[PDB]
């Protein structure tokens, strides 16, 4: 006798398990057990992943309901699961979206300058360099302080909440509440700080005093700051880090993008497609009985949308493990989700990665791992897959 198949399969972000293609071929929706002990439906084909993400009766909001089967424990207040819904209901969606595009004057130049400075510092210090802790994550942190309009010197502490805030835990995490409450207090202070007049927090500060938004809660305004910082920093830092591994392990591609940087956007789109940064499927709770492939999912059941299931599906992306810069459907991957909850930071995330990669290839054309790839230490029980350190030489 064996127990029900457990998720997640592996915390390694440098290879997809053979099990994924096996499940997708044999049982593209199948029952699994999560770290809390709950049962869930794991969905692993492109067709079924898109079906679930495009049907709001598979609800994000309802995953926070008391007594629901859970992927992992909440690390935010339950009302904050419906963050985007709350933002939209407050009439703030257009403003929040507009503030987090990469198109503000000087933003991309700021990204380039920051990437180049970080790289120059690594070159001065000499190999080996840690491209996660001393490149990708600081670049993400600096970007998000700029986007939010908050002081650069406040970035590192906000960042250090993240190794706990984005845990994927069976049980509630006391440190997550301590850091959440402190970070909310910080953002509430930012809204009251007369110096904060630019970026997302400058805009929210002004809308807060606009009579058209007088009944929006201060709680929501502060929450937008904490959640957008956290989601953007963890997602961009983690994606860039694992994309750098994918690139470093493909010297031919590394060389091609070095030689022809105009191909970097297409390269980043493929790096997004093959990215294993999300450690768990995207959770949804069924609010009705809904047929998904061979399974009638029942009201109240948990469904997990496995992004790499979709993104490595050979029926949608032939030769899925290969980076091909001339695919006919290149942005049709699910790296940013799909439907109601499609990532609002997608353009910014693309630009962060494109600029980071462009700068690294110019400064370190000979970049290579400084340790055998198996020596990377993969963070466990976390909402992202990331190596604790990424040692390189050049």
Q: Is 345 in the site for ligand HEM (CB under 6 A)?
A: yes
Please state, in angstroms and rounded to a whole number, the distance separating the CA atoms of residues 83 and 369.
Answer: 39
User: Among 305, 280, 303, which residue's Cα sits nearest to residue 381?
Assistant: 280
Please state, in angstroms and rounded to a whole number, the distance separating the CA atoms of residues 73 and 382.
Answer: 11
Stretch that binds ligand HEM, among 35-43, 113-121, 210-218, 232-240 (CB under 6 A): 232-240
Q: Is 52 in the site for ligand HEM (CB under 6 A)?
A: no
Most distant CA pair in the chain, distance: 65
Q: Is 59 in the site for ligand HEM (CB under 6 A)?
A: no
Minimum Å gap between C-beta 238 and ligand HEM is: 8
Please state, in angstroms and rounded to a whole number, the distance separating the CA atoms of residues 160 and 375.
Answer: 24
Q: Is 343 in the site for ligand HEM (CB under 6 A)?
A: yes
Instruction: Name residue 33's beta-bridge partners.
Output: 6, 39
Helix (H, G, I), strand (E, B) or coil at 209: coil
The CB density around residue 149, as the number of other CB atoms within 10 Å, is 21
| Binder among 8, 13, 149, 232 for ligand HEM (CB under 6 A) | 232
Stretch that binds ligand HEM, among 11-19, 336-344, 362-370, 378-386 (CB under 6 A): 336-344
Minimum Å gap between C-beta 383 and ligand HEM is: 10
Mask for 249-288, x = binds ligand HEM (CB under 6 A): ----------------------------x----x------
| Binder among 349, 360, 369, 384 for ligand HEM (CB under 6 A) | 349
Instruction: Please give the torsion angle defined by the CA atoms of residues 251, 253, 257 and 259, in that order, rounded to the nearest 10 degrees.
Output: 70
Q: Is 207 in the site for ligand HEM (CB under 6 A)?
A: no
Q: Which residue has the tokens 């970097």?
A: 264
Please state, in angstroms and rounded to a whole number, the distance separating the CA atoms of residues 277 and 241.
Answer: 9
In which element (H, E) is residue 251 found? helix 251-259
Please state, in angstroms and rounded to a whole number, the distance separating the CA atoms of residues 145 and 156.
Answer: 10
Q: Is 15 left (phi over 0), alpha (psi -120 to 50) or beta?
A: beta
82-101 positions binding ligand HEM, by CB under 6 A: 83-84, 100
Stretch that binds ligand HEM, among 155-163, 171-179, 202-210, 333-341 (CB under 6 A): 333-341
Stretch that binds ligand HEM, among 34-42, 177-185, 226-234, 255-263 (CB under 6 A): 226-234
Nearer to ligand HEM, 60 or 118 (CB): 60
Q: Which residues bind ligand HEM (CB under 6 A)?
A: 60, 83-84, 100, 227-228, 231-232, 235-236, 239, 277, 282, 335-337, 341, 343-345, 348-349
């Amino acid at each position: 006798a064996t127990v029900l198949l457990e998720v997640p399969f592996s915390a390694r972000g440098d290879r997809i398990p053979d099990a994924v293609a096996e499940l997708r071929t044999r049982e593209p929706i199948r029952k699994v057990r999560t770290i809390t002990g709950a049962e869930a439906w794991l969905v692993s084909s492109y067709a079924l992943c898109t079906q679930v993400l495009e049907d709001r009766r598979f609800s994000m909001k309802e995953t926070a309901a008391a007594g629901a089967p859970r992927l992992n424990a909440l690390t935010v207040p339950p009302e904050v699961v419906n963050n985007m819904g709350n933002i939209a209901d407050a009439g703030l969606r257009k403003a929040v979206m507009k503030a987090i595009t990469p198109k503000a004057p000087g933003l991309e130049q700021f990204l380039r300058d920051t990437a180049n400075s970080l790289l120059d510092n690594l070159i001065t210090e000499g190999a080996p360099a840690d491209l996660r802790n001393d490149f990708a994550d600081p670049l993400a942190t600096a970007l998000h302080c700029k986007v939010l309009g908050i002081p650069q010197e406040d970035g590192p502490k906000l960042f250090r909440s993240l190794s706990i805030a984005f845990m994927s835990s069976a049980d509630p995490i006391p440190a997550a509440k301590i850091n959440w409450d402190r970070d909310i207090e910080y953002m509430a202070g930012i809204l009251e700080n007369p110096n904060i007049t630019t970026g997302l927090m400058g805009e929210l500060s002004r809308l807060r005093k606009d009579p058209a938004y007088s009944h929006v809660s201060d709680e929501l305004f502060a929450t937008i700051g904490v959640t957008f910082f956290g989601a953007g920093v963890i997602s961009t830092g983690s994606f860039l880090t694992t994309a750098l591994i994918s690139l470093i392990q493909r010297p031919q591609l590394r060389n091609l993008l070095h030689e022809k940087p105009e191909l970097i956007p297409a390269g980043v789109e493929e790096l997004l497609r093959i990215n294993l940064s999300f450690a768990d499927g995207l959770p949804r709770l069924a609010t009705a009985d809904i047929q998904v492939g061979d399974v009638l999912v029942r009201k109240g059941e948990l469904v997990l949308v496995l992004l790499e299931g979709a993104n490595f599906d050979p029926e949608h992306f032939p030769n899925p493990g290969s980076i091909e810069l001339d695919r006919p459907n290149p942005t049709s991957h699910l790296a940013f989700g799909r439907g109601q909850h499609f990532c609002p930071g997608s353009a910014l995330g693309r630009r962060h990665a494109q600029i980071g990669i462009e700068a690294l290839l110019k400064k370190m054309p000979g970049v290579d791992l400084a340790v055998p790839i198996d020596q990377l230490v993969w963070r466990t029980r976390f909402q992202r897959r990331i190596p604790e350190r990424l040692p390189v030489l050049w």
